[PDB]
Curated annotation (Swiss-Prot):
Complex formation: Homodimer.
Protein name per Swiss-Prot or TrEMBL: Diphtheria toxin repressor
The HTH dtxR-type domain, residue ranges: 1-62
Entries under Pfam families matching the protein: DtxR, Fe_dep_repr_C, Fe_dep_repress
Subcellular location: Cytoplasm
Domain of life: Bacteria
Function according to Swiss-Prot or TrEMBL: Iron-binding repressor of the dipheteria toxin gene expression. May serve as a global regulator of gene expression. Represses ripA under iron excess.
The species this protein was found in: Corynebacterium diphtheriae (strain PW8)
Amino acid sequence: LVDTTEMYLRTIYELEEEGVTPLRARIAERLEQSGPTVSQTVARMERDGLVVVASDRSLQMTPTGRTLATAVMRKHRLAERLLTDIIGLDINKVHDEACRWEHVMSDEVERRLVKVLKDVSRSPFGNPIPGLDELGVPGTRVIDAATSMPRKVRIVQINEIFQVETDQFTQLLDADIRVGSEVEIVDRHITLSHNGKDVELLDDLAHTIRIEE
């Protein structure tokens, strides 16, 4: 979705990146938006806890805001790589096309691009592609990763240390399910199959085991 917020957050990231103080007028200018429009939007992003207008009058992205900004930049850059390296779009048209593609490319498509692309170190324009670590190329929780249709993944972590209920610890071991184990999943109780064994997790384990796509 063409979020103006995403556009504003990656504009700030760019400015910082060029060593430019992320001031409002600079953003109004870069974004071809008026100062008032910008002010209205910044005040909005503030309500969302994505940015803080410093005493300096510079825009300080909050941690969550910086995480989104980064993700948007990563998508933009992976998209640029796709466009130049595979599709072969005129280099002169690559940037603007990517500016549009950064708002619609899913994390799922990004991971495949990291896979099919020869090198995702940097953008065709020279800047490095950020957030590759956060994309995962820690881990998606089984709870959120549990699809109604079975799927296979790699256990990133078990988090036995944070468990109060330990009655399924041996189930996992008998089932041969450990960190790095490729297992089947599905929604319903949440079942985690592997080595012939099916482990129907309980709430706590379901919210703490993290599956890598």
